[PDB]
Amino acid sequence: TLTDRTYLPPLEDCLTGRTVILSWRLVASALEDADLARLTSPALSTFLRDGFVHELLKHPARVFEPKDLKQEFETKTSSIAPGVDTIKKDALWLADAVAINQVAALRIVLIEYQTRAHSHLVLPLSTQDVANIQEAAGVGDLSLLNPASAVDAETMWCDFETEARRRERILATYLSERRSFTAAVDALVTFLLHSAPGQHKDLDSLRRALLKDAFAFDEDLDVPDRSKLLTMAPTYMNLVEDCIARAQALPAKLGESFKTEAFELDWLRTAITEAVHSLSIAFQALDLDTPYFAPHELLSEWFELMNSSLFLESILGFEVVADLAMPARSLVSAICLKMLNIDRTIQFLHDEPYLLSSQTLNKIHTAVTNAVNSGVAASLPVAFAWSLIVHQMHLGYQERAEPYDDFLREQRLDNDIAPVEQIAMLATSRGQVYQVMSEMALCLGTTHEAAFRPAVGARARLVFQDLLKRSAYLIPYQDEPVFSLLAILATGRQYWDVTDALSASSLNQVYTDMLDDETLFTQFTMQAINRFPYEFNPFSVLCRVLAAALITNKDKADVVTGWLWRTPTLTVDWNPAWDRSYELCFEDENTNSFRLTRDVDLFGERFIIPEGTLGRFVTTARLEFEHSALALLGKRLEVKAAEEICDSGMAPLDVDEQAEAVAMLATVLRAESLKSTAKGGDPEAPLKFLKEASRLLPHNKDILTVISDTIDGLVEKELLELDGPQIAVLASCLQFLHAALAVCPGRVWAYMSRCALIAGDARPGRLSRITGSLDMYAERFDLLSSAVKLFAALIDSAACSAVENPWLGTSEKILSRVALAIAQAALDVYESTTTWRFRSELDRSILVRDVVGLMHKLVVHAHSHLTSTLSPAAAHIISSFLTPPPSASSLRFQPLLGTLLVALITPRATLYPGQSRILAERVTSVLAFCTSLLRAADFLGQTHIPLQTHLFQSACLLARLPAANAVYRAPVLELLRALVEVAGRPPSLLGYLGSHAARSFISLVEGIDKPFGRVEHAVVTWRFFAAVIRNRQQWMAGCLLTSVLAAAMERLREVKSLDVQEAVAVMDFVVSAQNYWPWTIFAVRKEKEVVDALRGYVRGLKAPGMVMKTDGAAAAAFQARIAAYVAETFAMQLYHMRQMRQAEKFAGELVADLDYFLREGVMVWGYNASLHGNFARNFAKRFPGVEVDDFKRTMWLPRELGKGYYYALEVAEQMLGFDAGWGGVKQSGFRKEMETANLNLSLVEAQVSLFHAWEYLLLELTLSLLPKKENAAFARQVLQVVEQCLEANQRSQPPENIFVVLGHARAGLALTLLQRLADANQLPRDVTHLLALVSSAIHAVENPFGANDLPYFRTLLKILFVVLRAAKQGTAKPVAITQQVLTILDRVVARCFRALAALVHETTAPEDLALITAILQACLSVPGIEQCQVQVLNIMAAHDVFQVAVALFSWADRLLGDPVYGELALLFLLELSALPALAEHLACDGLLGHLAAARLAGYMRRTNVGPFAENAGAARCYAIWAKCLLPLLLNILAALGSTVAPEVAWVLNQFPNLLQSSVERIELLEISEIHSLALLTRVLAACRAQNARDVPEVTWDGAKVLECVEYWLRGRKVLRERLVPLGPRENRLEEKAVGLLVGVREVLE
Amino acid sequence: VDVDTYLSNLQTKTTLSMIADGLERSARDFDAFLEENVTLEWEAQRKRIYQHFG
C-alpha cells in the first residue's frame, strides 16, 4: 500500500502541465529554506506524509538503483496527447545509458520537459538581448559582459529543440536530482532534529507527524524510539562508498559524445555533493546520541573505507572541486572524531565500546597511520585524537604489567612510545592541526561564509571542542590552541552577527559547555580571565562572543556582567616605576609571590590598587584583587584617545587591542540592550553598562564621548592615509555608535550632526572623498559596511520616532540635515560601488544590499505631519534617480544591471545558504527599489524617466531571473507590473525580450505557483496580468492568450472551494481581459458559458444581507468586491447580447439572481460612522501632537484592499509601537480598532465600486426588457430602483470626499430608468408615495441652484418633472394626491422662479428656467387640479409671480439681438393662463398693455420677422410673438371674451405687418399661427355685432386663407415640400399638420 | 459566422463604456419626451378651447 501515485503524478497530468511533479529540487529548496507556506502546502505536505516517500528516503539507493521494472514502465506510458513517443524514447535511453530503473528515468525526463522553459530562459542571452543590455549599460564607464560569439536567438532555439541538447538537459536534470534528493534528506533531518522553538503550529504538526510515521519517533512518549533514526548513518555511509566509486568511473553504456569535459566535471561534482549531504545526514544521526558509543563493526567498515579512500582525498585532488573539498574534508574529519568521542573513550578505559575489539583498533590505527604518512592536512585532527587515545591506552596497560592488549602487541607499541609521540608532535608542530581546525570551524560556523548550515556547524564544532578539552592539560597554555578555540567559538563573526534569535537549545551547547563542564572552564575560560588585560585577545573575544550567545539564556545572562563588574584576578606587565611599591614574601622560591607596599596609581576618583595586595611574578605580574575591569578598560580607552601618556601607569592600548576593546564594548552593549527590551529583562541594563564604563572618568564625559573624540581625532586626517588598524578602530567605533543608538539616540544624533565623516556645508566630507578606484579589502570594507549599516539604523530610528529622556539635545533641523547628508553619502557609496575592487562578490553583495535598503526606506517614507523630519533626504534620492542627466542616469543604473547579471549568472548551489540568502536579498531589494521609484515617478507626475527605458531594455534579464530561482518570481512581476503601469499613461516588450524569450517567459509564468498553490504568488501574477491588459500592452497580451484562458476558467469552476483573496484577483483579471479585449474572450466565454454562468449564479445569489452577523464578518470586503466584479462581468456581456439581439431569454434567466444587489446594492447603508468617530476621539485625546488624518495614504502605491487600506497600518505598527498599551493585552487596544475601522472603510470603498458596477448592470438589462411580455419583472425593477433611491438619497451621512459622484449618479439612474418605462407606458397611476418624498428631498438642499450643488439641483428638478408627468397619466378619481401635488408644486415653482429672476437680473440659468416652466405646465395638466383652480390662483397671487414675470421679460432693450428671457417669461405666463382663472387674472392685470409698451413688441413690429429668418433675432421674434400672444389671446378670451375683445383687437391691429406677411407666404409652425389667427378673427367678428366702439375694424384679410389652405389640401407630394420641423419628425408629421389644416378650414367657410 | 461579422464591425475604442453613450442617448430621449408631452398637452388644451366655442 506504498505506491508512487503521490510521488509522481500520472503521465497525462505531467505532460499537459495540469499537475507539476514535486521534483527533489523544489523539495530540497523548501526544506533548506524551511518555508512555511511551501512545506505546509497541500501538495508538498501530502508528498512528505507519503509512506512511499518515507521508504525511499530511508533507503536512498532505491531512488536510482537499477531494477527490472518493464511492466510498470509500459503500463504508465501506454494509453495516455501526442508527444509520448519522444518521452518514452528518452526515458528508455536514459535507463539504459545510466543503468537505473525505468520509472526514475521517466520522471527525470518529465521534469526536463516541464522545465524546458526554465532551461531555455537560463541559457546565455542572444544577440538582440546582448545589444539591449549594452544600450541599457551605456558608453560611459567595467561591465564584464559575455562574449559576442553568441548566435541569434532563432539558431539557439533551433539547436535547443534538437535531440543532443535535450539529452544533455536530461542528464543535467538527473544529476541535479541526485544532488537535490541528498540535500533534501539532509534538510529534513536537521528540520526534524534541531528546528528552532516557536515554530508555526501547522509546521510543528507536520514535523511531529513525519517523526512518528517515518521513524516511530512519537514525542508523546517520555523516551521516544530512535532506532529508525539511527539506522540512517550506515545506509548513507554505504551510499558514500558507492558515490566515491562512481566519481572514479563514468557510465559505461553512455556514448563518448555525451562524455564531454563539462559533463565529466558535472558528474564528479554531483558525486562529491551527494557524498557531502549523505555525510551530513550521517553526522546528524550520530550526533543525536551524544553520550553513548557506536557499534564497533560500523567503525571497522567506516575506517576501512577511509583507509581505501584516504578520507575522501582520492576524489578531492582536482582544483575545481576545492569549494566542495574544504566542506567535505571538514565533515569527514569531524564525523571520524565524533565516532571516536575521545571524552568517553579515555573516561572508560580508566573507569560495547570499540576498545574491546582489537580488529576495529587495528583498522583505525592503519587508517590513521596511512593518512599521516601520506601527508594531507585534513587528517591531522583525527590523528591527534587517536594519538592521545593510544597514549592513555599505553599508560593503562603499563600499569597492568606489574582485548586492546592484543592490538597494542600486534602493533608493537607495548614498550615504546615514540611511534605515537611522533604523530602527536607532527600534528601539533607549527600549529598545523590547530590551523586546520580553525579552518574547519570557519566553514562549520555561524558566519555567512560557512559551507554548512549553522546547526550542523555547531555540532561539528562540538567534536573539536571535546578534542581541545581533553588535550588542554597535557599541553601548556599556548597561542596556537587558544586561538584555535577562539576561532571555533567566534567563527570569524562581527558585531552585525549579533541577534536575539531563539535557536534549538541543543545548538547553544558549544557555547554553554564553556561554563558547564569543569575542564574547559578551568583551563581556558578562567585562564583568559586571569591573563587579561596582559593578553587582551583571549578575554576580549570570549566576552564578545558569550554576550551574544547568552542573549536568550536566562541562567547565564549574568556571567559576562559579573566578570566585567567583578573580576577576581588581574594581570599586567611590570613597569620599572613600581619597583619601590612591593616586597617579596619569602615563602617559596619558585612561587615568587610578593605583596604591594604602596598605592599603585595606574595612569599616573582614579584607578588605584590599594596597598598590601598580593601578587606573583610568573615570568609580567598577576594580582588577585576584586575589581571592575569594565571601568578599567573605559579609562584605558579614554587615555589612548586623549593621547595622554602616563610614565607611572600601565602600558597603553595598542591599535589592535584598541579596536578589539571598542568592538567588545559595542557587542556587549548591543546584547545588554537586546535582552533588556526582552520580556522581563531589566530595562536599564544598557544604561548601567554605559555608566559603569563611564565610571572613574572625567565627571561629565562618558564612554560615548570617548568614542566620539576617538572618531574625531582619527578622522582629522583623510581616510586613505589612515592605516588598517585605525580603519578597524573606526569601524568598531561605528559599531558602538550603532549599539548606543537604541538606548540613547539623542547623543548619537547630536554627535552625527557635526561628524566629519558625513558631508556638511562646512567641509565636503571625508567619507565622500575616499571614493575612487581603491580596493575594498577587509580592512576598509569592514569600515564601509559598518558605516552603511549605521546609516540605515539611523534612518530607521528617525522614521520610528513618533515624538531621563531618549531624545535629548536634538531637534527637527538636526534630524533633517543629518538625514540629507546621510543620503548624500549613501548615494556616493552606491555610485562608487561600480569601479571598486572588492575582496569578493559577496562583500559587494552585502554592501549593495545595505545601501539599497537604506535608500528604499527613504523612498518608502517619502511616500504628513512628521514627514518633513526626513523629507529632504528622500527628495534628494528620488530626484537623483528619476530625473538625472544622461551620464548620471547610466552610472546610477549600472549597479542594478550588474546585480541582475550576477543574479542569473551565478550557479545554483545546495551549500553555503548564507551567500545565496544575501544574494537573493540584494536582488529583491533592487527589484523593490526600482518598483518604488517607478511608483513615485508615476505619482508625482514626471513623465520622461530614464529608468523606464533602462528597465525595458534590461527586461532580457528580468524575464530570465525567475528561471534562475523561484524566489525572484514575485518581486520581478511586481516590478514589471509597475514598469508597464507607469508607461501605460506605447513601448514595445518583445522587441526587447524576443519571440523565443517572451514565449518561454510566458510558459514559465503560466500555471501560477502550481506546485505549492500559494496565495500571495497567485495574487501577484494575476494582478500582473490584469495591469498588463490595463496598460495597453496589446501585443504580449494577444500572444499570451493563446491555455491561460482555460486555466482561469478552471480556477473559477470551484470558487467556493478556493479562497476569496485568490478569487478577487483572478476575476479582476477576467474583467480586464473582457473589457479591453472583448471579441477574443466572448468566443471562449460561449465555450465555457454553461459552467461559468452556473458558478456566477451561485456566488451572486449567496446574498448575505448581514455580512457582519455571519461568520465571515471581517471577510465582507472581499465578498462585496467579488460581487461587484461579477456584476461588471455579466453586465457588458448582456449589453453585447442586446447588440446581438439574442438577449430576450438570457436576460429573463439572469434576472433571477439579483436579490443581493436589490437588498443593499445601490444603497451604501452600511458605513457605521460612529465607530470611525470614536476612533478619532480616542486617537485625538490620547495624542495632541498627531491627528487621525495624518495617516491617510497618498495613493503612492496602487491602493490595495486588505488588512490595511485607508490607514497605513504598515507604518503605524512601527511608529505608534514606541508607546505602551497600543498593542494591549489579549488583542485588545487601538491596533485592533484601526484594523476594524480600515476594514469597514475597505468594504465601504468596495460598496461604492458596486454602486458603479450596478449602475452599469441594471441599464442594459432594463433595455433588454422592453418587449411587452414579462411585465412583472420590469415592474419589480422600477420599484426596486425607486426604493433604493428613496432610502439612499436621505440620511446618507457619508464622508464628503468621494460622495460627490454618488449624489449625481443616483439621480441620473433614477431619471433614466423612469423615463425608459415612461416610454414603455406601463407605469402605475399611484406614484404619490415617492412624489412626497422627492419633494422632501428637493426641500432638503440648503441653497437652490448653488454653485457647488447646481448639477444636483438640476437633476433633482428633472426627476420631479418626469415623476409629475407619470403622475398625471392616471385616473385617481373616476391622504389624497391632489393636495400633495398642489402644495409641492406651489412651493417649488414660486421659490425657484423668484430666486432665479433675482440672480439673473444682472447659460445654466435660462435652461433651468425653461425646465421650471415645463414643470409648471406638467403639474397644471394633472386631472385633479381643474377643480381647485381657485387655490392655484390664490397661491399664485400670494407670491407676485405675475409682476416679476412681466418685469423681466423686458430685461434689456435698445430703442429705435434676440429675446430669449422674454420668450421664456411669456411661455411661463401662457402656461399659467392655460386654464381660464389665471387667464382672467392676467387679463385683469393689463398684461397686454405691459407687453405692448415694452420694446420686444417694437422688435416684433419690424418687417424682418420671419419663421426661418436670416437672423436669430427675427426667428426668435417670430416664435415668441406667435407663442406668447396668439394662444394667450384665445386663453384670455375664453373668460369674459366680450369684455376683453377690445384689447385683443387693439393688440392685433397694432401690428399688421405680421398679419399680412404670414397670409402672404401661406399663399412649419405657421400652420398653428394662421389657425389661431383665423379662430380669433372669426370669433371677434361675431362679438363685434353688439358694440361698434369695440373692435372698430377687424383688419384681417382672411379671404385668401380659404383658397391657400385648399391648394395644399389634396397634394400628398406637394405637402412635403416646405415642411421642416424643429423637433424630430419621428409615423409622419404630415399626420398632424394636415389635421390642423382640416381643423382650420371648416370654421371660416 | 456571427463572430467574424462583429469583428468586421469592431470599433477600435474602449468597449467597456459603450453604454455611457446609451445613457446620454437616454438623456436626449428624456428631452424628447419633455418636448412631446408639453407640446401635445397644451395643443390638446387649445383643441378643447377650439371645440368649446365651435
Task: Fill in the keyword field for this structure.
heterodimer, A: 1645 residues, mainly alpha, two-stranded antiparallel ribbon, 64% helix, elongated, B: 54 residues, 0% strand, Nucleoporin NIC96 (chain B), membrane (chain A), protein transport (chain A)
What do you see in this structure?
- Chain A: Keywords: Membrane, mRNA transport, Nuclear pore complex, Nucleus, Protein transport, Translocation, Transport.
- Chain A: Belongs to the Nup188 family.
- Chain A: One of its GO terms (cellular component) is nuclear pore inner ring.
- Chain A: Its main location: nucleus.
- Chain A is elongated and about 175 Å long.
- Among the domains of chain A are: 1-124 and 152-223, no CATH class; 1324-1413; 1440-1597.
- Chain A starts with 10 loop residues before the first helix and ends with a helix.
- By secondary structure, chain A is mostly helical.
- Chain A contains 79 helices and nine strands.
- In chain A, the strands form three sheets. Chain A has a five-stranded antiparallel β-sheet with strand order 1-7-6-3-2, with helices on one face.
- With 54 residues, chain B is an all-alpha fold.
- Chain B has one domain.
- Chain B contains two helices and no strands.
- Chain B starts with a helix and ends with a helix.
- The chains are: A mainly alpha (1645), B mainly alpha (54).
- The A-B interface holds A 1075-1076, 1078-1079, 1082-1083, 1132, 1135, 1140, 1256, 1259-1260, 1263, 1308, 1311-1312, 1315-1316, 1318-1319, 1358, 1361-1362, 1365, 1414, 1417-1418, 1421, 1470-1471, 1474, 1527, 1530-1531, 1534, 1572, 1575, 1579, 1623-1624, 1639, 1643 and B 2-3, 6-7, 10, 14-16, 18-19, 22-23, 26-27, 29-30, 32-39, 41-42, 45-47, 49-50, 52-54.
